[PDB]
């Protein structure tokens, strides 16, 4: 039932993520509150966030809360991938541990354009330049993500493609410390098989789109490797930037 493995994964994607590509493009076309300077950030915090430090530290805390929620949605999505709930609980944990941020930065592309990113459930839009304006090390977090996203978005994927791509990212048989490698590789084989057939049908004019996407998965691995290095730096050198517990679990010992 290949056409139904795809549909099951797509359905699980639409069920579990608040933000997706069709919703983001509707908003990014035609109004989110633009955050482009310190004044608008403060106004946005008044109107979009309920409950005092440097601007950069407040942005970092809001971002963490968001990542905590995305990690939670991705866990629910993962449990809905055929076979995943059958793996060993340790392997489930290992697959999400290394997979979530690859998935998060793929999906972040959906809400990014070259000028900024849609944030807060579609209700704000932060300019890329404002984020560059922040002081080090916080002006370094988002930029490499915009760079990745501009290359990713040029592939013109839709949510049916992205759902399978994210499933393939999560079902990766070469993560450090997997116990039952063969069981994961067999799952991934089927997802990737369905992804190749789905792209062939959904994008019949890009004959290299499947290997283009495999390469993006390796690009996202490097992107997360570097991201985890910037986070480790932040966690040493910034007194006010402690990680939410679930995020500490995920980053501890990562790369």
């Amino acid at each position: 039932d290949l056409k139904s493995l795809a549909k099951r994964i797509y359905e699980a994607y639409l069920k579990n993520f608040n933000m997706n590509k069709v919703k983001a493009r509707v908003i990014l076309s035609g109004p989110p509150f633009v955050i482009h300077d310190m004044e608008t950030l403060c106004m946005a915090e008044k109107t979009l966030v309920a409950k005092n430090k440097e601007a950069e530290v407040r942005i970092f805390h809001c971002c963490q809360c968001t990542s905590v929620e995305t990690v939670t949605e991705l866990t629910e999505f993962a449990k809905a991938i055929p076979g995943f709930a059958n793996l060993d609980l340790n392997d489930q944990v290992t697959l999400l541990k290394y997979g979530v941020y690859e998935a998060i930065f793929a999906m972040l592309s959906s809400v990014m354009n070259k000028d900024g990113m849609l944030v807060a459930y579609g209700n704000g839009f932060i300019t890329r330049e404002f984020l560059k304006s922040l002081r080090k090390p916080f002006c370094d977090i988002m930029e490499p993500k915009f760079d990745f996203a501009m290359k990713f978005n040029a592939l013109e994927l839709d949510d049916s493609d992205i759902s399978l791509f994210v499933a393939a990212i999560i079902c990766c048989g070469d993560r450090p410390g997997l116990l039952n490698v063969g069981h994961i590789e067999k799952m991934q084989e089927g997802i990737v098989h369905v992804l190749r057939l789905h792209l062939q049908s959904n994008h019949p004019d890009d004959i290299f789109l499947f290997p283009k996407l495999l390469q993006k998965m390796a690009d996202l691995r490097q992107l997360v490797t570097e991201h985890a290095q910037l986070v480790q730096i932040i966690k040493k050198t910034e007194s006010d930037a402690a990680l939410h517990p679930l995020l500490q679990e995920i980053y501890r010992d990562m790369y």
């Binding site: 866990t75 609980l89 944990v93 999400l96 517990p245 679990e249």
Partner: peptide, 11 residues
């Protein structure tokens, strides 16, 4: 070692 995530997974 991944207490919260393990909790999430078993729900």
């Amino acid at each position: 070692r991944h207490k919260i995530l393990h909790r999430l997974l078993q729900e």
